[PDB]
Every structure is written in structure tokens, then in C-alpha cells.
Design a protein around this ligand. Structure first.
Ligand SMILES: Nc1nc2c(ncn2[C@@H]2O[C@H](COP(=O)(O)OP(=O)(O)OP(=O)(O)O)[C@@H](O)[C@H]2O)c(=O)[nH]1
Ligand SMILES: Nc1nc2c(ncn2[C@@H]2O[C@H](COP(=O)(O)OP(=O)(O)OP(=O)(O)O)[C@@H](O)[C@H]2O)c(=O)[nH]1
Ligand SMILES: Nc1nc2c(ncn2[C@@H]2O[C@H](COP(=O)(O)OP(=O)(O)O)[C@@H](O)[C@H]2O)c(=O)[nH]1
Ligand SMILES: Nc1nc2c(ncn2[C@@H]2O[C@H](COP(=O)(O)OP(=O)(O)O)[C@@H](O)[C@H]2O)c(=O)[nH]1
Ligand SMILES: [Mg+2]
Ligand SMILES: [Mg+2]
Lengths: 431, 430, 431, 430
């Protein structure tokens, strides 16, 4: 009755969705073939004969990444029409995925989303997984969000994007795509949870003792966060959090909607045995800058709002004591105009351990989603990079040759400057 | 689905292409007779990129072999993987260009270009989604340079949007293999700068240096240099044919390596090159691959990247590795050599990772570098060109074949503009 | 496919063709009777029943030298109509071989060459063997070259001529014939590879330890040079060199087209056993002034272009190292306007040892064809001799009585003066 | 195929011709009966040069025997090789010229020249490709001298483009065999200078010196002198007749040793010329042949080459020998004797080589020298002529035969012009 539709765009989104749906199948006991030997109803639809079909759409502009899914261990899980692929990727070009290649596939994906939503008695909204610094992840995602804002304007749309890391980068045009997609989706998105690959690498090294992690581990952690959220949506708990709750609590202003995600009990099995991961300890670990999953220091900014979603053997009074302790701490600073800046949800379902994974089996967990002004710094850095290239018009011909115009570059940069000014104004003291 | 059409022009092009097709067949498990004898399913998953399936489950390379003499065609046909190519795809003349660009671009190649284009169109029609073209040739020669340039121009006119990569063996710095090398190289580059998206420059002297100093090969024949070039080509196109944690086709590399349209001349390199007697004294790990890749002496073009600044770099890894390690190594490389990367392009490195390493290896990586040091090579050629054009030496061979000296001046001016642009962006400051 | 026609004119040409075709038959395994107990295609034609007829014409104005062939070992090899003879030679008289006696046989030889060309699929060109100082070799060769240029204008025409020696000489009117034939053939020839009998005598004495060599050994060495070139044309090699490659890489200007041939591993078996004739060794021996087959010291001029044609077990890397070493040498000087003055060809077929010859079996060999301004000196000397006689009009009546005019002598001398001026200008520094 | 017509005039001419045909038949294996009894196939491969094949495969010399008395015809007919010549080719008168040039050129020779010319025309028509003519005669006599000159003039009128060689026996310096020798010699030379292409001046006294001091013959006979003359004749015609490394026919030698039309008087010589007393000591090598050939003692004319300069020289070697050695010896001879060769003809030597040596020898060579020292001879004769013409001694015979003293003055003037030309070219400088 609270159906939520997951849309995975590009290689990053598709590979994160692989882990997410493996985790959901494990949590609900669904075999990879789709057979369980009504909590799942929000994400799975029963096929009459006892088969469960995910309420997901895997869309990419190239066949390889989704063709791995179509022939992988979970080939029997996804509806074959829900795995949509193009013929040529966007080639790390926003214009290709938004103007030239995207326009040839947008109708198909919208039709599939309509078919999925028709079966939904009550549609909560969409969870869009993608990457900021990709062609289809950035351009096609913006086009899809634009179309959704018209087809389902009222429904809530939450994004799970891989914000480009401050230093680590796998492409040279990431700032262009990031600025363009941010400008496009700054008004068509409700909440945008951010995670950097660099921060997750640091966490994996420090906490999980994995010296050489790959994208599989990062995707497992991101899937754990997405679980926490959709599990507050799925299972039964003392305090329940819906998508609209995230939208209402984490977004003080329509444009300041970029929370950062965090997961406290990131710990290896060997190390977990020596720690009593109490609610207070995981709450404290959530606010430790070293545990942030976006490579930005919250101490440089102020916490606009926080949303703590606990799972497992969690007592509400323990949560209250931990949050009071956090409020007492002066290393953690909150904006003046938010005297009460803590949304809290509690769920009775503890996290499930994916076999072959790295995370330990725990009785308690917490996912924090924090809207903080520190993210502004990241934006500034990104903006600077954009300038450095747009001064020379580097790579600009690639975008202009695919339907874009330099006017769009200028408009996106102006909008991003306005966003920076908005963040600066929000961070000031009311006095 | 993303078919690539391979074209070989001249002796150098045809020989390198033969070795390239041997390498690709080994990668995809195609026997010299065309039958698939592989063991992994991934080999046939993207066989359509380079091969065309024929009746009886035989795979025919999607290659066009072009020359102006039949000797190279006969040598290729009579050899290992000779029957692999379609017989109808061997287009050749009878005279030869005589190491003359004018002959191969205006008189001898003009007659054969219509037939070659008919074959190319026929090969392109049977493509669900054409990705681009590949040309293997030599700039310093006759048939190769001029005929391949004419074909490049005509194909670009017919297929303006498709990608056009050329693996061109440009003249070596120290010793020349043809007296008229500067003329052919200048006239070829004057068109490559305008009718291609990626030009992987390769020098035979750099390959000799690699074979004698890195591989410790006492007697490196052309088979070994061609094997190196084939490894580079396969590494460049691997992400199109196999899955990985970070895919990158030809267009992705072109977008990430060409800040401006005219700056599309790259220096390639291969990471795991090691002597036979040292294969047990080295750790095959991402740090070692990166260190070998970014070394000056590993570059396949006889240019020193320390004499310029890297406009951009791409690294296509192959094998099961950790993205954390790859990203950390690239960050360390960029931080250590902060002076060898342009400051106005943050994160100069583009990374792609595949899952299937080359046969017989656990890890590999192809490095592509768009650096301003390439200007030196052009400068060198330009100098020689003037040295011969001032006295009009050997010029009557080109003018007598239907060229005007104004064309020579235009080509020289174009290459001078190219080196000027490369220097300008080397000196550009944020 | 790549068919080439050999035309042997005069006694020198016919007696060099004897050795050339003996060598070709040995190389291709063809018996002297034309039978073998498709590399043999650019020079032989298959007559259905396995007989291989040489693609050559033996033309002379007297019967003796060709009647030796018609009754010799290879009497059964050549097509009887290809061996063309007159009745009275030119008697060392250019006019007789060009105007009076040549005109009566020119049509026959042209008809035979037309038959040969028709029998060919793709005609690379002609190799004209002759002698500068002979009557028919000088006059009839010029007439034939004029007619061929009229008929096959585009086809390349290469000459293998015996340039008169500086001191050794067998005729008193050599300068007249040489100057006249050079004047007549200057505008109708592409390349003219030149050798001297005196230089080859010196080479045979010093290298092969033959104290009394005859024309047979000279012809064997010249045939080895021709075999190197035509082997680049015949067998399969790493680097292939066609006739047009010579024509293009060796002739900077239309009139400066007189290279000098040189064969590196000239050595007897007894001396060869004690030597490791590596690529570097033979390459260095090529540029030794004493090893030139034209009696000209290359140190008196500047190399304009060199064509190194390697054979047998040769590695491209070794060739590159040797050529780099040569370029390092300061005694070997090139012109300022030829920074790239090396055409390199490599063939996989090692030289074939003729049973009864003096050359030892070797694994490698290089034939070097260098255009050099040193030849200018030779020209000057030749011209000097011409003047010494033309001042007294000595022997001029013999030429005038055979349909020639003294105006022709004056015009030829002026043309050779212009050629000397051209060489002087070309040798000047570009500064 | 290069037929030569041999004409013998007078007693000296007929005897020299008889010995010449003995030598030639020995060379070609023809026995005195006209039948081939040789061994090598080369003897018949060019028999047509000198012989006519008759029915029954008998070879008839292409010789015309002319005399004005029947004694010499009878002697030649009755002797070895006397049944070799065609009976129709004996054309003789009854009276004889009486050692009188006028009788043999105007009265008797005039009467018989028509028949001689008819026979010559028949011989020339029978020929396939006529090469030239040969005349053996003596200038001292009247029949030989006058008749040979008349025949030479008439044949040249009929066949102006053919080669005409005369092996003429010039008067000796010391002792004269005829009182009127200067008159006949001068009147004959006045025609030879104009109607001949090559004249080989032979003196009997030089031949006596050769046969006494070189061959150590105690009692030399005209047989031996005729043998030497025949050896030189056969050497030249053998250059013509047999295969060799460097061929040379009559026209080649004429072109290479006649810088000007009137300078065509040569001195011949034979190379080996070794006595039996020393045949076992000296080594037969090209250096020895050359040294003997260029020795002034070996010349067959009584003119010292050291008193003039060699306008030109021809060396017709015979036998298997190294061309390198021949050329080295020629160059050494020219360098050592640089003062004896005109400086304005570089390379004054014309070399020909033949594979087949003379019978009984392994090596041989014929030397033909065009030198200015020959002027001496003419000068000698000239002075003698004046000595008698001033007093008009013996002149009434010539006048009565039907001549005029103005003819004598013209002949003397022409001889003076000849000596003037020879001296001028001796004194000419580059
Ligand atoms: N966490 C995570 N990041 C990923 C993954 N795959 C790619 N990325 C990151 O996403 C960015 C690259 O975007 P792609 O995922 O390559 O983008 P795309 O949307 O597939 O774009 P095109 O292929 O250009 O159409 C880089 O920052 C990668 O590090 C993944 O599985 N997990
Ligand atoms: N290397 C070489 N030189 C030769 C040979 N035969 C003759 N010569 C040289 O060629 C020149 C003479 O040319 P001929 O060969 O006599 O010329 P032709 O063209 O036959 O002329 P005619 O017979 O006079 O019509 C001299 O330099 C000879 O030494 C030979 O077999 N080899
Ligand atoms: N790497 C490589 N270079 C080659 C090969 N064959 C020829 N070349 C180079 O190509 C140039 C000669 O051009 P070629 O290929 O002969 O010319 P074309 O066929 O006339 O276009 C020289 O630089 C040779 O070194 C080969 O197999 N491999
Ligand atoms: N060499 C040589 N000279 C001869 C011979 N017979 C005569 N003579 C010379 O010729 C001259 C005599 O002239 P001849 O030939 O008898 O005169 P003709 O009968 O008047 O023509 C003298 O010089 C003789 O010495 C001979 O057999 N051999
Ligand atoms: Mg992608
Ligand atoms: Mg000849």
C-alpha cells in the first residue's frame, strides 16, 4: 500500500541496485529466482504464482552493465522489460544522455515506469540511484526527473547520487556534468542523499580493515544505508519514517536539499567482538567526521538538520539520552534557526549480513542523514573546477555538438553561484 | 552491437593489422580457421564488435585490407590466420605508390578508393549500431599514408559522427626508413588533424628501445613491435568487448582526452612489459603497472613527456583489481608530478577498468597520453620538411603527380599551427 | 603481377644478362632448360607445361655475343625470338648504333617488348643493362629509351650501365659515346645505377683475393647487385622496395639520377670463415670508400640519398642501430637539405651462391645505392676528355658520316656542362 | 656472316696470300682439299667470313688471285693448298707490269681490271653481308702496286661504305729490291691515302730483323716473313671471326685508330715471337706479350716508334686471359711511356680479346700502331723520289706508258701533305 519505485540509472546506479536488490532479497527471504520458500509489498509485487518482481527499473544507455544483470545470478528476479538498455552510452557527456541519446529512450523508460506505477495502489515515490559525474547518470537522470515532475508532480522523488569526490576522480569532465545536472534537477528533486567514493574508501580502510576495497564493498555499504531508509518504510517499528518525512524534515528550503549519509556500525567481524556497540556509541560514531560518507568536514559548517534512523535492539530512552549528549557537545554545532533539529525513527528489524560481505553481524544500527552547511564547501570546490575549465572552454565542443549551447553552461554556473549564496545566507546567524 | 570497422593500408598497416587480428582472435578464442574454440562465455558475448558471424558459426573479421601492391596481401593470406579474413575484403592495386604521397592520394589511390569505399559501405551496412572505424597505417610511407588519408577523409564525409581512430606509425627521430618521410608525414598530418578523433602516434625507435631495454629482446623483429601495437589496440578497445567495474568505449576516451578538436594526438603504452628472465622478480600489482605506465621510457612514441605537460591521460586497466588502489595510485601520480599536468584541468586522469586480462596475464593496463610534448615530434617533422622544401628536393615527384606547391605550404602552415596550439596550451595558466 | 622486363643491349649488357639469368634460375630453382624439378613471376612467364621463359630481351647489333647464348648452356631457356641480333655492330660508334644501324632493328625490338608487355598483367618497368662506352650500348640504348618513353611514358625505366673507368679503358672513343648517350638519355631515364670495371677489379683483388679476374667475376658481382634489387621485388621481406621506391627516394631532381651501387659482403670462403659479418659490419663496409663499385671517392662529395637493401637474416633493430652509427660518423657527409637520407629495404631471402663463383655463402648482405655529388667529379673528368678530342675534331668524321652533325657534339657538351652546374648547385649548402 | 673478300695482286701479294690461306685453313680446320677436318664447332660457326661453302661441303676461299704474269699463278696452283682456290678466281695476264707502275695501272692493269672486277662483283653478290675487302700487295713492284691501287680505286667507287684494308709491303730503308721503287711507292701511296681505310705498312728489313734477332732463324726465307704477315692478318680477322670477351671487327679498329681520314697507315706486330732456343725459358703471360708488343724491335715496319708519338694503338689478344691483367698492362704501358702518346687522345689504346688462340699457342696478340713515326718512312721515300725526279731518271718509261709528269708532282705533293699532317699532329698540344 506504500509502494516505492526504484530507478537505477547508469553504471553506478545499476551496480548499486544490484547490491540493493540482493540485500532486499536476503532481508525478505526471497530467493534470487524470485520465489520465497506483506512487508515486501512496498518493493516487490507478487506474481500470483508466488513469484516476486521488484518494483525497479534498471535503465542505462549501454548494454554491458545491464547485460551482466540479465545473465547474472539474479537473471530470474527482474522483469525482462524492467531492464532497459540503449545501444551507445552517453560517453561521459551530459548532452548525449540528456539531448541526443537520452531522448531516444526516455519514452520507453517512462512507459515502463507508468506500467509499474499502475500496479501501485498507493505510490510513495521514486528512489533514483545514479552518479553525478556520468553521461547517463547526470544527463539522462535530469531528463527523467524533468519528465517525472510532470507525470507525477506531487509524488516525492529522492535521489541516491555519488557526489564527485574532492580528489579521487575517474573522469576529466566530472565538474561539467555535475554542474549541469545540479542546475537541471535543483527544482525537480525533493531530497538528494550524497555519498563520495573517496569517503567510503577511507571508511573501508579504517573501519573494515580492507586495504584494497572495490566497488562491490562500496555498493554493499550504500545498500545498507538504502536498506535502513526503506526498512523504516518496510518493517514495523516504534517510530516510523516515510519518504515525505524525509522531505519535510531534511529540507529547510526548496534548494537546500542535499543531505549527507552516514552509517555508524561499520565494523569487521573480528573487531566487532571486542566492542559493545550500544546506542550511545553508534550515535557518537555517526557524528564523528571520520565516519562521514561524504568527504567533507561537518566541523567546518553547521548542521541544518539531522535524521537518525535506528534499527534493531534500540530503546527510545537510550536514543533520547544519546541525542541529548550530542546536543550538549559543542564540537557539533547547529544553526540558530533550528532549535529542534533531530528527526528520529526506530525500527525493530536489525540489519541483515550479506553472505560474503565485510560488515559484521550486529544487533543495533543507525543511519544518519544530515543536512549541513559544510556541503557548501564541496559545491564551491566543484564550482571552482568548472571555472578552471570553462575559462579555456575545454571539452565544450563535445557538449555543444550534442544539442547543448554555451548559454546552458553559463546559466548552470549562475544557478550554482546562486546556490552557493543561498547556502551562505542559510549558514549566517539570525541574531 | 558497437561494431568497429578495421582498415589496413600499406605494408605497415597490413602487418600490424595481421598481428592485431591474431591477438584479438586469441582474446576471443577464435581459431585461425574462424571457428570459436574458446572456453569462457564472455568471449562470444561481444564478438560482434570486431567479428561478423557467418553460416556454420564461423567468425569473419570485419576488416578491410588495402594496399597498392599485391605482395603484402599475398604474405598475409599465406600465413597463420590468413584464411580468417573474407576473400572479398582484399582490395589491392598492381603498381604501388612508390613511397609517394601524391601517387597514393591522387592517382594510384584515387582509382582504388571507390572500390575500397564500396567494400566499406557493404561492411558498414551489416552493423546494428556502428561505433566507429580503425585505421592502421604509416605516415612516412606511400600507399599507407596517402591512401589511408584519402579513405579517412571520404569515410568522415560519409559518416561524420562515427568515431575514427588511427594507429599511425609516424617517422622516427634518429634514423629514417624513407628519404621522403617528411613530405608524406606532413601531408598526412595536415589531414589527420582535421578528419580524425584519435591518432595514436607510434615510433619504431621507441618500440626498439622498449624491446631492447625493457623486454631484453636480443633480436626484436617487426613481429614483436607489431605485437606491442596490437596489445595497445586491444587494451584501448577492451571495455567495448568485456564487462568491467568502469566501462569506457572509444567515444568516452575521445571525450575525456580531447579538450579541443585539433589536440587528438596520443602517445600509448603498455604496463606489464617485462623481460622473460625478470617475470619472477616483480610483483604484478596496480602500483607497478602505474609506475611502468607513467615512465617516459615506456611510451611508444619517441617523445619525452617530461618536456611538456599532460593535457590528459587515460588508463584502461584489465583484470580483477581494486578501484580503491587504482584511484589512490592515480591521485598519487597526479600529486607527485604536479608540474607535468596542466593546472587548468583538475583530475587530468580518466580511469576505466575491465575484468578480463589479456591471455597469460593476471593484470594489464593500456595508457594513453595527450601531452604537449607531442609537439616536439611535429616540430621535428616540420623542420625536416622545410629543409627539403626550401630546395624543392624530391618535389617534382609530387608536383608531377598532380599536386601544387601551395598544397605543401598549406600543410606546413597547418602543422605549424598545430605546434603553436600545443605550445599555447602548454603555457596556459589558470 | 609485378612484372618487370629486362633489356640487355650490346656485348656488356648481354654478358651481364647471362650472369643475371643464371643467378635468377639458381635462386628460383629453375633448370637451365626452363623446367623446375609464384615468386618466379616478376621475371619468368609460365608456358603452360611448366617451362619458364625469362621476361627479357637480348638485343645486339652483331651475332657473336648472342650466338654464344643461342648455343650455350641456356640455349633452351630464352625464347628464340627474344634474342635479337643485327649483322654489323656499331663499331664503338654512337651514330651507327643510333642513326644508321640501330634504325634497322629498333622496330623489331620494340615489337618484341610490346609482346612481352602484353603478356604482363601489371608492368612495373624496365631494367636496361648496357655500357656507356660501347657503340650499340650507348647509341642504340638511347634510341630504345626514347622509343620506350614515347610508348610507355609513365613506366619507370632503370639502367644498369658500366660507367667508363677513370683510367682503365678499352676504346679510344669512349668519351664521345658517353657524353652523347648521357645527353640523349637524360630526359628519358628515371634512375641509372652505375658501376666501373676498374672499381670492381680493385674489389676483386682486395676482397676476393683474385689476382687475375675476368669479366665473368665482374658480371657475377653486378648480377648480385641486380639480384638484391629484384629480390626486394621478388621474395617476401619485412620492408618491401618497388622500382618506384628507387625512382622516388634516389632522384632529388630530374637530372640528378646517377646513383652508385655497392655490395657489402664481398669476401672469399677462406676469409669469410674468420669473420662474423653482422649487420653493422656490412653496413659499415658499404660506406667504405674502397668498397665503392664506381671509382669515385665519396669523401669528395655529399650523399644526397642512400638506399640500403638488406637480405637474409637481418633484424630491423640492427639495421636502425647501424644506420644511426653511420649518421654519427663525421667522415660521411650528407647534403643540408636531406635530413632523412636513408631508404631501407629488408628481404628474408639470403644471397644465393652460384656454383663456381668466388663469393662465399653468407647469411646477410646489403646493396647500397647512393646518389652522391662525388659522381660530379667523374662527369667533369669525362667531359674534359671529350674536350681534349673535340678541340682537334679527332674521330668526328666517323660520327658525321653516319647521319650526325657536329651541332650534336656541341649540344651534348653544353648539356653535360649544365649537368655539372646542376651538381655544383645541388652540393651547395642551403645557408 | 661478315664476309671479307681477299684480293692478292703481284708476286709479293700472291705469296703472302698463299701463306695467309694456309694459316687461315689451319685455324678453321680446312684441309688443303677444302674439306673440314677440324675438331671444335667454333671453326665452322664463322667459316662464312672467309670461305664459301660449295656442294659436297667443300670450302672455297673467297680469294681473287691477280697477277700480270702466269708464273706466280702456276706456283700457287701447284702446291699445298693450291687446289683450294676456285679455278675461275685466277685472273692473270701474259706480259707483266715489268716493275712499272704505269704499265700495271694504265696499259696492262687497265686491260685486266675489268675481268678482275667481274670476279669481285660475283664474289660480293654471293656474300650475305659484306664486311669489307683485303688486299695483299707490294708497293715496290709494278703489278702489285699499280694494279692493287687501280682495283682499290674502282672497288671503292663501287662499294664506298665498305672497309678496305691493304697489307702492303713498303720499300725497305737500307736495300732496295727494285731500282724504280720510289716511283711506284709514291704513286701507290698517293692513291692509298685516298681510297683505303686501313693500310698495314710492312717492311721486309724489319721482318729480317725479327726473324734473325728474335726468332734466331739462321736462314730466314720468304716463307717465314709471309708467316709473320699472315699471323698479323689472321689476328685481326680472328678478332672478327671467333667469340671473345671483347669483340672487335675491322670497322671497330678503323674507328678506334683513324682520328682523321688520311691518318690510316699502321705498323703491325705479333706478340709471342719466341725462338725455339728460348721457348722453354720465358713465361707466356699478358705482361710478356704486352712488353714484346710495345718493343720497338718487334714492329714489322722499319720505323722507330720512339721517334714519334702513338696517335692510337690496338691490341687484339687471343686466348683465355684475365681482362683485369690486360687493362692493367695497358694502363702501365700508357703511364710509363706518357711521352710517346699524344696527350690530346686520352686512353690511346683499344683492347679486344678473343677466346681462341692461334694453333700451337696458349696465348697471343696482335699490335697495330697508328704513330707519327710512320712519317719517317714517307719522308725517306719522298726524298728518294725527288732524287730521281729532279734528273727525271727512269721517267721515260712511265711517260711512254701514258702518264704525265704532273701526275708525279701531284703524288709528291700528296705525300708531302701526308708527312706534314703527321708531323703537325705529333707537335699538337692539348
Ligand atoms: N559507488 C560506486 N560508484 C560507481 C560505481 N560505478 C561507477 N561509479 C562512479 O560513478 C562515476 C562514473 O559514472 P558511471 O557510473 O561511469 O556513469 P554512467 O552514468 O554509467 O555514464 P556513461 O557510461 O558515460 O553513460 C565515477 O565517479 C565512478 O567512480 C559503482 O558501482 N559504485
Ligand atoms: N663489366 C663488364 N663490362 C663489360 C663487359 N663486356 C664489355 N664491357 C665493357 O663495356 C665497354 C665496351 O662496350 P661493348 O660491350 O664493347 O659495347 P657494345 O654495346 O657491345 O658495342 P659494339 O660491339 O661496339 O656495337 C668496355 O668498357 C668493356 O670493358 C662485361 O661482360 N662486363
Ligand atoms: N611498426 C612497424 N612499422 C613498419 C612495419 N612495416 C613497415 N613499417 C614502417 O613503415 C614505414 C615504411 O612505410 P611502408 O609501411 O613501407 O609504406 P606504404 O606501404 O608505402 O604505405 C617505415 O617507418 C617502416 O619502419 C611493420 O610491420 N611494423
Ligand atoms: N714479304 C715478301 N715480300 C716479297 C715477296 N715476294 C716479293 N716481295 C717483295 O716485293 C717487292 C717485289 O715486288 P713484286 O711483289 O715482286 O712485284 P710485281 O710482280 O711487279 O707486282 C720487293 O720488295 C720484294 O722484296 C714475298 O713472298 N714476301
Ligand atoms: Mg556507463
Ligand atoms: Mg660488340
Amino acid at each position: 500500500m506504500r509502494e516505492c519505485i526504484s530507478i537505477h540509472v547508469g553504471q553506478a546506479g545499476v551496480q548499486i541496485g544490484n547490491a540493493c536488490w540482493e540485500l532486499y532479497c536476503l532481508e525478505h527471504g526471497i530467493q534470487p529466482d524470485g520465489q520465497m520458500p506483506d512487508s515486501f509489498n512496498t518493493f516487490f509485487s507478487e506474481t500470483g504464482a508466488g513469484k516476486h518482481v521488484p518494483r525497479a527499473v534498471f535503465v542505462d544507455l549501454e548494454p554491458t552493465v545491464i547485460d551482466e544483470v540479465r545473465t547474472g545470478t539474479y537473471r530470474q528476479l527482474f522483469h525482462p522489460e524492467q531492464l532497459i538498455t540503449g545501444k551507445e552510452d552517453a560517453a561521459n557527456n551530459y548532452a548525449r544522455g540528456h539531448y541526443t541519446i537520452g531522448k531516444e529512450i526516455i519514452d520507453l523508460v517512462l512507459d515502463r515506469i507508468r506500467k509499474l506505477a499502475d500496479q501501485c495502489t498507493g505510490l510513495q515515490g521514486f528512489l533514483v540511484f545514479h552518479s553525478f559525474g556520468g553521461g547517463t547518470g547526470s544527463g539522462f537522470t535530469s531528463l527523467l526527473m524533468e519528465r517525472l515532475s510532470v507525470d507525477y508532480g506531487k509524488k516525492s522523488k529522492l535521489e541516491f547520487s555519488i557526489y564527485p569526490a574532492p580528489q579521487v576522480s575517474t573522469a576529466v569532465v566530472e565538474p561539467y556534468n555535475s554542474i549541469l545536472t545540479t542546475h537541471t534537477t535543483l527544482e525537480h528533486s525533493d531530497c538528494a542523499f550524497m555519498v563520495d567514493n573517496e569517503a567510503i574508501y577511507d571508511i573501508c580502510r579504517r573501519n573494515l580493515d580492507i586495504e584494497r576495497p572495490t566497488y562491490t564493498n562500496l555498493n554493499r555499504l550504500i545498500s545498507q544505508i538504502v536498506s535502513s531508509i526503506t526498512a523504516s518504510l518496510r518493517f514495523d517499528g516504534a517510530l516510523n519514517v516515510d519518504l515525505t518525512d524525509f522531505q519535510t524534515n531534511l529540507v529547510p528550503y526548496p534548494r537546500i536539499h542535499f543531505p549527507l549519509a552516514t552509517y555508524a556500525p561499520v565494523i569487521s567481524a573480528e573487531k566487532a567482538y571486542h566492542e559493545q556497540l550500544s546506542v550511545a556509541e553508534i550515535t557518537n560514531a555517526c557524528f564523528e567526521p571520520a565516519n562521514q560518507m561524504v568527504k567533507c568536514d561537518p566541523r567546518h559548517g553547521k548542521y541544518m538538520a539531522c535524521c537518525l534512523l535506528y534499527r534493531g535492539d534500540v530503546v527510545p530512552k537510550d536514543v533520547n539520552a544519546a541525542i541529548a549528549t550530542i546536543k550538549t557537545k559543542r564540537s557539533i554545532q547547529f544553526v540558530d534557526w533550528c532549535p529542534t533539529g533531530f528527526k528520529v525513527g526506530i525500527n525493530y528489524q536489525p540489519p541483515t549480513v550479506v553472505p560474503g560481505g565485510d560488515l559484521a553481524k550486529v544487533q543495533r544500527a543507525v543511519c544518519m542523514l544530515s543536512n549541513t552547511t559544510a556541503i557548501a564547501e564541496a559545491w564551491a570546490r566543484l564550482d571552482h573546477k568548472f571555472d578552471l575549465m570553462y575559462a579555456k572552454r575545454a571539452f565544450v565542443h563535445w557538449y555543444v555538438g550534442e544539442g547543448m549551447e554555451e548559454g546552458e553552461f553559463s546559466e548552470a554556473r549562475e544557478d550554482m553561484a546562486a546556490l552557493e549564496k543561498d547556502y551562505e545566507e542559510v549558514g549566517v546567524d539570525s541574531v | 552491437m558497437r561494431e568497429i570497422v578495421h582498415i589496413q593500408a600499406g605494408q605497415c598497416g597490413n602487418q600490424i593489422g595481421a598481428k592485431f587480428w591474431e591477438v584479438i582472435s586469441d582474446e576471443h578464442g577464435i581459431d585461425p580457421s574462424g571457428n570459436y574454440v574458446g572456453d569462457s562465455d564472455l568471449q562470444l558475448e561481444r564478438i560482434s564488435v570486431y567479428y561478423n558471424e557467418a553460416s556454420s558459426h564461423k567468425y569473419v573479421p570485419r576488416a578491410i585490407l588495402v594496399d597498392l601492391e599485391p605482395g603484402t596481401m599475398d604474405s598475409v593470406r599465406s600465413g597463420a590466420f590468413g584464411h580468417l579474413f573474407r576473400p572479398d575484403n582484399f582490395i589491392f592495386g598492381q603498381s604501388g605508390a612508390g613511397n609517394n604521397w601524391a601517387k597514393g592520394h591522387y592517382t594510384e589511390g584515387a582509382e582504388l578508393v571507390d572500390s575500397v569505399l564500396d567494400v566499406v559501405r557493404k561492411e558498414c551496412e551489416n552493423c546494428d549500431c556502428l561505433q566507429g572505424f580503425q585505421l592502421t597505417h604509416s605516415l612516412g610511407g606511400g600507399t599507407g599514408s596517402g591512401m589511408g588519408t584519402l579513405l579517412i577523409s571520404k569515410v568522415r564525409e560519409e559518416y561524420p559522427d562515427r568515431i575514427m581512430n588511427t594507429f599511425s606509425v609516424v617517422p622516427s627521430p634518429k634514423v629514417s626508413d624513407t628519404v621522403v618521410e617528411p613530405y608524406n608525414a606532413t601531408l598526412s598530418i595536415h589531414q589527420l588533424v582535421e578528419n580524425t578523433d584519435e591518432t595514436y602516434c607510434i615510433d619504431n625507435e621507441a618500440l626498439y628501445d622498449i624491446c631492447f631495454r625493457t623486454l631484453k629482446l636480443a633480436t626484436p623483429t617487426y613481429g614483436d613491435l607489431n605485437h606491442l601495437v596490437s596489445a595497445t589496440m586491444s587494451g584501448v578497445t577492451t571495455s567495448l568487448r568485456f564487462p568491467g567495474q568502469l566501462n569506457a568505449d572509444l567515444r568516452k576516451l575521445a571525450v575525456n582526452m580531447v579538450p579541443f578538436p585539433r589536440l587528438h594526438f596520443f602517445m600509448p603504452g603498455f604496463a606489464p612489459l617485462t623481460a622473460r628472465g625478470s617475470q619472477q622478480y616483480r610483483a604484478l600489482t596496480v602500483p607497478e603497472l602505474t609506475q611502468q605506465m607513467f615512465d617516459a621510457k615506456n611510451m611508444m612514441a619517441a617523445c619525452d613527456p617530461r618536456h611538456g605537460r599532460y593535457l590528459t591521460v587515460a588508463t584502461v586497466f584489465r583484470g580483477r583489481m581494486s578501484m580503491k588502489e587504482v584511484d589512490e595510485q592515480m591521485l598519487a601520480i597526479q600529486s607527485k608530478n604536479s608540474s607535468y599536468f596542466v593546472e587548468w584541468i583538475p583530475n587530468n586522469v580518466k580511469v576505466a577498468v575491465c575484468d578480463i586480462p589479456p591471455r597469460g596475464l593476471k593484470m594489464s593496463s593500456t595508457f594513453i597520453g595527450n601531452s604537449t610534448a607531442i609537439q616536439e615530434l611535429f616540430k621535428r617533422i616540420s623542420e625536416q620538411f622545410t629543409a627539403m622544401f626550401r630546395r624543392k628536393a624530391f618535389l617534382h615527384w609530387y608536383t608531377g603527380e598532380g599536386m601544387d606547391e601551395m598544397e605543401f605550404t598549406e600543410a606546413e602552415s597547418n602543422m605549424n599551427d598545430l605546434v603553436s596550439e600545443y605550445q599555447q596550451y602548454q603555457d596556459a595558466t589558470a
